[PDB]
Ligand binder design. Structure first.
Ligand code: NA
Ligand code: NA
Length: 327
DNA sequence: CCGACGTCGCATTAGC
DNA sequence: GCTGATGCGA
DNA sequence: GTCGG
């Protein structure tokens, strides 16, 4: 639906969501407002009243009241106020820095540190992740066009294969669903030598190679199974350099790989629909496994999974292309 | 009325 | 020194 | 904040 239809309302709800998460440290209210913003965003009618909106799942009495106020006045008093508030707006802003959550933001603003400049002045009070977040503040908020994602995938698949041709690497996220743009790159990695029942340098060797060819530029965190860092496409001659990008790489046991690929391919909406289907067939599906219930409700062991289709087939669904998994 | 609301790897840190 | 809790991000 | 046991 066009933004013009209820964009004022959904923008209002998103802003409220952010203040709950970043200022009030109320994560569940944050997700309440987001859920309401999503369902309203998909509503194919211009909302005429709070009562109309309340019919939608996730919109309750209080959001109905806010919509009435917005419709009758074009603003929300509480939002106008908190927007104007020096401390609250500063706390909310600082959390746009990767690594600065509500708690770090609150602590910075308590001691007078309110802007990117104040951060730039006080690097010794920032941890490693936060420094990297500050360094790439602008780049990290840019989207990644699919053409660059393809170029990024090219490098990743190539370098992974150069390390060991028996690795299996899959770039997931909305990119795998064919999205025209991405927020970051999510790479799922496995290897036949790594199972649930079985080196812990499988991940390190791949990260090391990607650093060696100067694709990976910085590290946010890194252990034996999850890497989170920064990358950059090489610059095309006398052209402007590419933005730095967020890349995650996780190593998953072979027997849990395709469950992982399914899960991180999404979308979130499609995943829950599929998780519902789902139990009904007497199966529990999470990021790692699919398991049978269970006349009482006792999960049996993980069923063997050798492809995404294998999962679909357990729950008697026909395989669905990543492009067809928006819901 | 009142609890659930996703879960967990890694980095940092609090307490012993 | 170690272990557990918390913050953070996805 | 919303839902539902
Ligand atoms: Na409702
Ligand atoms: Na942040």
């Amino acid at each position: 639906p066009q933004e013009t239809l209820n964009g004022g309302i959904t923008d209002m709800l998103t802003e409220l969501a952010n203040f709950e998460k970043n200022v009030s440290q109320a994560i569940h209210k944050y997700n309440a407002y987001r859920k309401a913003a999503s369902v309203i965003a998909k509503y194919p009618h211009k909302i005429k009243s709070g009562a109309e909106a309340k019919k939608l799942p996730g919109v309750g009495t209080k959001i109905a009241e806010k919509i009435d106020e917005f419709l009758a006045t074009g603003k929300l008093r509480k939002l106008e106020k908190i927007r104007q508030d020096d401390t609250s707006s500063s706390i909310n802003f600082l959390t746009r820095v990767s690594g600065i959550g509500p708690s770090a933001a609150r602590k910075f603003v308590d001691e007078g540190i309110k802007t990117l400049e104040d951060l730039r002045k006080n690097e010794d009070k920032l941890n490693h992740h936060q420094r990297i977040g500050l360094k790439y503040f602008g780049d990290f908020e840019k989207r990644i066009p699919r053409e660059e994602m393809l170029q990024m995938q090219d490098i990743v698949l190539n370098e992974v294969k150069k390390v060991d041709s028996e690795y299996i690497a899959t770039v997931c996220g909305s990119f795998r669903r064919g999205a025209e743009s991405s927020g970051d790159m999510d790479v799922l990695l496995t290897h036949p030598s790594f199972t649930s029942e079985s080196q812990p340098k499988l991940l390190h060797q791949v990260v090391e190679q990607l650093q060696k060819v100067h694709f990976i530029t910085d590290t946010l965190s890194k252990g034996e199974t999850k890497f989170m860092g920064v990358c950059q496409l090489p610059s095309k001659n006398d052209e402007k350099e590419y933005p730095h990008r967020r890349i995650d790489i996780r190593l998953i046991p072979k027997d849990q790989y395709y469950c992982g690929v399914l899960y991180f391919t999404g979308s979130d909406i499609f995943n829950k629909n599929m998780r519902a289907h789902a139990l009904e067939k007497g199966f529990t599906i999470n990021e790692y496994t699919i398991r049978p219930l269970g006349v009482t409700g006792v999960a049996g062991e993980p069923l063997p999974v050798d492809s995404e289709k294998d999962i679909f087939d357990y729950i008697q669904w026909k395989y669905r292309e990543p492009k067809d998994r928006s819901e």
